[PDB]
């Protein structure tokens, strides 16, 4: 008799789960959940004992535009007040290190305009704005068709991307960074792998992978920034499997294939080295998945800004070198913290008896604090002292006594970001 | 006052002075990030410049959710029957991340809660 | 059925063991130790 009762329970739970799927796979529901779940995922991988802080500001993309369009200028925007005015520009306050926007951007003119404003804001506050790209940005339904794209460079030649192309040429683009595919936040509910109480719920992911709780990669990138700071109080160690751009401990999900077993990739796709490089060339931050593991990595953090080409001469190549350093976030983060230290520490010196050469003397002794100019300092030292050389010149503002014009130029240690190898067999080689 | 107090001048005056030379003391700056996003199910009437930011850390994350007050009013296909015109409207409330578990979802949806109650009754056989 | 297992090393290459494989690479794994088969605690009850 009980066997039939058990069958009733089976069919009951079957029906209940069918309904439960609808709520859990609801786009509104997932928006809410992924927001807060992704937030904690960020929060609990930081260390608040290392002088890390984070604030939440509830804002939709639509009302960001509302505010930016409403205000007469960016200096009177509500966000500017929260970021710049109440922080960086306030005596006794503190400056916002970076802004993480939980958004997906398309090529739509509204999205483009929003990025323009965020670039301006970041430039003024000296803090980068990080967010993510939607699948449709690449003309595809989801990120699972990235392997079918034959050539992104050529794709972006379409009239469709006119505004985006102009955006990449702006001097404010250095403060924008957008990430590519999303990543899993939650393993599907399962009697064994992820059980719930009472109700025998087994979550049924359909053919649509949008049933999976995908999360915004920007948060992963954000934890990279935090770790670097937690260890060194600087943020350049965010672009390598070993350097600190590795994302460890991703969710896994083994399920039946064509009679075999396979795990849902933590990122929508398994990005190849060539595909990753292509995305890098187009200014995207692609989190790549280490095949067969639960680890992913950010191989580089190029900003939105497109590098300028100069004439092939000693001077022209130096110009290229300089400009490219500007286009990459691992170096801009150095500048950003320097800006923040200068703003704070100099306000303390206002009203002191300083002549022109007094500033040169003091500013020199100060910047040396972060310089490691040894023949071969170890990577740990190089991390905590990101600069190799620095130069400071101070001039007078003529016709305005007590005011000065200061120039600060720095040479950071270089990151290893690629190489070409030529292999050759040879006889009569000099013996090593 | 951070000046340091001394007694009125006498023939012999003794004062402790810390030998910091001319070194300029400095203040360590935190790394503060600002997470901006749609954390509620609706837009606020309060202007952006007026709504405030919330400091979050490991020791108060759940408290922050509770205080933020989350709510979802949404309609899903009603699959507890065999009618394409049947729709189910729910009003979910969240205080912590635990409230996004199916267990909580069922408890806040009578159409499922009663079926769970039924399940337990059947199990009690 | 341990005698019927032809190769444990190859067995652990399955996707099934992804998390376990990562666990073994952590610097905290030094403080974990797990044992294999169980052992008898009691001889079955018997008149003698």
Question: Are 3 or more Cβ–Cβ pairs between B and C shorter than 8 Å?
Answer: no
- B51/A58 Cβ within 8 A: yes
Residues 6 or more apart from A69 whose CB is under 8 A from it? none
**Residue C15: which of A248, A263, A295 has the nearest Cβ?**
A263
**Residue B31: which of A43, A226, A345 has the nearest Cβ?**
A226
DSSP string covering A405-417? EEEEEEEEPPP--
Alpha helices in chain B (DSSP H): 61-68, 102-107, 110-123
CA pair distance A345, A49, nearest whole angstrom: 23
Q: How far is CA A308 from CA A169, A316, A317, in A?
A: 9, 11, 11
- B30/A53 Cβ within 8 A: yes
Dihedrals phi, psi of A190, to nearest 5 degrees: -155, 130
DSSP-derived 3-state class of residue A198: coil
- Joined tokens for residue A94: 């503190």
Nearest CA in chain C to A261: C15
Q: Where are the beta strands (DSSP E) in A283-422?
A: 284-285, 287-289, 296-298, 387-396, 404-412
Q: What is the helix, strand, coil percentage profile of chain C, to 5?
A: 40, 0, 60
Name the method of structure determination.
cryo-EM
A58 interaction partners in chain B (CB closer than 8 Å): 36-40, 44, 51, 68
CA pair distance B22, A365, nearest whole angstrom: 12
CA pair distance A257, A263, nearest whole angstrom: 9
CA pair distance A265, A249, nearest whole angstrom: 13
- The residue behind tokens 């922080």 is A87
- Inter-residue contact A356 to A395 (CB < 8 Å): yes
- Joined tokens for residue A222: 């954000």
Q: What is the helix, strand, coil percentage profile of chain A, to 5?
A: 45, 15, 40
A261 interaction partners in chain C (CB closer than 8 Å): 14-16
CA pair distance B60, B41, nearest whole angstrom: 22
Residues 6 or more apart from A274 whose CB is under 8 A from it? none
Show the CA angle centred on residue A21, arms to residues A18 and A25, nearest 5°: 150
CA pair distance A223, A54, nearest whole angstrom: 11
Residues 6 or more apart from A283 whose CB is under 8 A from it? A168, A178, A302, A303, A304, A305, A306
CA pair distance B78, A206, nearest whole angstrom: 18
**Residue A12: which of B49, B109, B122 has the nearest Cβ?**
B122
CA pair distance A291, A276, nearest whole angstrom: 14
- Inter-residue contact A96 to B32 (CB < 8 Å): yes
- Inter-residue contact A49 to A59 (CB < 8 Å): no
Alpha helices in A350-401 (DSSP H): 356-367, 379-384
Q: Which of B62, A24, A274, A202 is nearest to B54 (CA)?
A: B62
Question: Which residues lie across from A20 on neighbouring strands?
Answer: none
- Inter-residue contact A223 to A45 (CB < 8 Å): yes
Question: Which residues lie across from B99 on neighbouring strands?
Answer: none
Resolution (A): 3.5
């Amino acid at each position: 008799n009980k066997s039939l009762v058990d069958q009733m329970l089976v069919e009951l739970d079957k029906k209940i789960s069918a309904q439960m799927d609808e709520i859990l796979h609801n786009s509104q529901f997932q928006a809410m959940e992924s927001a807060w779940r992704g937030l904690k995922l960020f929060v609990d991988r930081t260390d608040f004992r290392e002088n890390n802080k984070v604030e939440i500001l509830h804002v939709t993309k639509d009302e960001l535009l509302e505010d930016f369009e409403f205000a007469p200028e960016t200096a009177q925007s509500g966000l500017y007040k929260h970021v710049y005015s109440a922080g960086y520009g306030q005596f006794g306050g503190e400056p916002v290190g970076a802004i993480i926007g939980n958004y997906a951007f398309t090529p739509s003119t509204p999205d483009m305009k929003l990025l323009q404003y965020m670039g301006a804001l970041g430039a003024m506050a000296h803090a980068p704005f990080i967010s993510s790209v939607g699948p449709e940005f690449f003309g595809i339904d989801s990120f699972e068709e990235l392997p079918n794209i034959k050539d992104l460079k050529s794709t972006f030649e379409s009239p469709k991307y006119t505004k985006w192309r102009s955006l990449r040429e702006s001097e404010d683009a250095r403060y924008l960074g957008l990430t590519a595919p999303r990543f899993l936040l939650r393993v599907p509910y399962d009697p064994i792998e992820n059980p719930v109480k009472s109700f025998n719920y087994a979550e049924n992911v359909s053919a649509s992978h949008e049933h999976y709780l995908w999360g915004n990669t920007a948060f992963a990138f954000a934890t990279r920034l935090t770790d670097s700071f937690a260890k060194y109080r600087w943020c350049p160690n965010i672009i390598g499997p070993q350097s600190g751009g590795a994302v460890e401990d991703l969710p896994v999900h083994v399920f039946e294939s064509m009679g075999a077993l396979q795990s849902k990739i933590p990122t929508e796709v398994l990005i190849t080295d060539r595909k990753e490089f292509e995305l890098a060339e187009e200014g995207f931050i692609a989190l790549t998945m280490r095949k067969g593991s639960d680890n992913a990595a950010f191989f580089s953090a190029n900003s939105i800004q497109k590098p300028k080409v100069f004439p092939n001469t000693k001077e022209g190549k130096e110009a290229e070198t300089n400009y490219k350093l500007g286009t990459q976030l691992p170096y801009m983060m150095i500048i950003n913290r320097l800006a923040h230290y200068v703003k704070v520490l100099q306000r303390e010196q206002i009203g002191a008896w300083k002549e022109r050469q007094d500033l040169e003397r003091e500013l020199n002794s100060w910047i040396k604090q972060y310089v490691a100019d040894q023949e071969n300092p170890p990577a740990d030292v190089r991390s905590r002292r990101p600069l190799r050389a620095a130069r400071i010149e101070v001039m007078d503002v003529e016709g305005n006594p007590g005011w000065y014009q200061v120039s600060l130029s720095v040479r950071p240690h270089f990151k290893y970001m690629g190489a070409n190898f030529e292999l050759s067999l040879v006889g009569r080689l000099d013996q090593a | 006052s951070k000046e340091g107090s001394v007694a009125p001048k006498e023939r012999i005056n003794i004062k402790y002075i810390p030998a910091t030379g001319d070194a300029q003391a400095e203040v360590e700056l935190p790394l503060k990030t600002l997470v901006v996003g749609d954390f509620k199910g609706h837009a606020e009437q309060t202007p952006l410049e007026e709504r405030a930011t919330v400091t979050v850390d490991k020791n108060n994350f759940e408290a922050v959710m509770r205080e933020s007050e989350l709510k979802i009013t949404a309609t899903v296909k009603n699959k507890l029957t065999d009618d394409e015109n049947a729709e189910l409207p729910v009003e979910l409330n969240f205080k912590s991340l635990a409230d996004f578990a199916p267990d909580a979802v069922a408890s806040q949806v009578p159409e499922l809660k009663k079926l769970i109650e039924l399940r337990e009754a059947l199990v009690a056989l």
